[PDB]
Structures are given as C-alpha cells and as structure tokens.
Design a protein around this ligand. Structure first.
Ligand code: MOO
Length: 231
C-alpha cells in the first residue's frame, strides 16, 4: 500500500527520513510532494489526490478547511518551530538569557541584527513581534540588517558579517555555520506551528496508521533531530 503526503518544503529531509523508517517497519511506501504551503493548499482545494497535508502555518490549513478540503476532525498541530537568536560559529558569543533585560546593544558589538524583512518575511514579522513585546524594538529598529528571506539572514551570520540573527530552530540546525545563543519565549510572538490533517475523503486504514505514526516516538525523534518541536 501507499500513502501520499503533501508537506511544506521545509519538512523535506525529516519527511524523507520518516518515509524510509516507515517503509522498513511497515512495508508501506510514503510518497511525498513538497512545495509551499500556499501551493499545496490550492492543489488540495482543487481536488488533488493527497491523503495527508502538513502545512507550515495555521493560515493555509484554515484555507483548506474553509474549502472543505480537509477533514476537520483530524486537524491538530503536529510541530512547532522556536524563534531563536543565532551567532556565527566563530563568534566569542556564548548562549545568553532572552528576556526584558537582555542588553542587545552590548551583544551587537557595534554591528547589526540580521532578520528577514519584517514587512513580509514571517521570521522577520515574528522577530519584530517578540522584540516589541520585550521592549527591545526601540533599541534594535535602527540597527537591523534586513534580508529577502530567512536564508539571506542566515547567510549574513554564517559569513560572520552580522554578529546575531533571528531565525527558526530548524533553520539553525540546518546551518552548520551558525550556533543558537538564545531562544525567544513562545508567548512573545505568534506561535510558529505546523498543523497536520487528513484530506477530506482519505480517512482509510493505511492513511490513518501513518497519520498516527507521525505523532509517535520514531517520527518525533526525527523531527527533533531536525530542530522542530513536537506535540
Ligand atoms: O510552506 Mo511556507 O511557504 O513556508 O508557508
């Protein structure tokens, strides 16, 4: 048998490892299609034969639910991604406590904070949220190094060109050139969350069993290894 998963592309490597583990354990092929959450939600809306949908945000799963394309009795948040402060691997910077008393000016060592463009990059929007809530935005706003996406903000830090950056936990794990030096409190910003649901009409035995497996120990260990949080 086989199960077809439409999963946000940020989950590519985790999902591929889970597929190989599930094959070797249950002898069932997991077929994954990776693309943006927007792309997959519209494909599912138009009737694509996906069995499961894992979105990188609640918004696009809300969209699929509004179009009656996913089974709402099966929807639940599968993963989180922490919002983290990263530094270049070679930096003297050690891990520090992130709270209302963090001395951001001293941590910047004369440089700028790398972020996704807070006008539209989600990691930047969330960075801005957390910094405003913690009362640091007044200090940090004139000291930003905005980037076109998370990868561009990561590149500033990997090349020692910015002393700090704000990315997701899974981005930090995928980048060998950066190290986590702090984690924002989850309530300082909107939660980064990956909901999972069975696509409407696809709640059969084999789909349901892989659906359950994604929440079990083997899949959870793989997600954590890639820097996601589990539920
Ligand atoms: O899958 Mo997305 O484009 O990161 O929301």
């Amino acid at each position: 048998g086989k199960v077809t998963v439409f999963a946000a592309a940020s989950l590519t490597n985790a999902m591929q490892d889970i597929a190989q583990a599930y094959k070797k354990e249950k002898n069932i092929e997991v077929v994954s299609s990776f693309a943006s959450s927007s792309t997959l939600a519209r494909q599912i809306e138009a009737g694509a034969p996906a069995d499961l949908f894992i979105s990188a945000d609640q918004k696009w799963m809300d969209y699929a639910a509004d179009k009656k394309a996913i089974d709402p009795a099966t929807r639940a948040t599968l993963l989180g991604n922490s919002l983290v402060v990263v530094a270049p691997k070679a930096s003297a910077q050690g891990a520090i406590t992130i709270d209302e008393k963090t001395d951001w000016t001293s941590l910047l060592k004369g440089g700028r904070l790398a972020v996704g463009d807070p006008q539209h990059v989600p990691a930047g929007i969330y960075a801005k949220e957390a910094l405003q809530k913690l009362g640091a935005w007044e200090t940090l706003s004139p000291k930003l190094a905005p980037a076109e996406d998370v990868r561009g903000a990561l590149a500033l830090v990997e090349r020692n060109e910015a002393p700090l950056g704000i990315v997701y936990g899974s981005d930090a794990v995928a980048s060998k050139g950066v190290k986590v030096v702090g984690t924002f409190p989850e309530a300082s910003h909107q939660k980064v969350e990956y909901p999972l649901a069975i696509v409407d009409g696809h709640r059969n035995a084999a789909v349901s069993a892989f659906y359950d497996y994604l929440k079990g120990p083997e899949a959870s260990a793989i997600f954590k290894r890639y820097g996601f949080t589990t539920r």
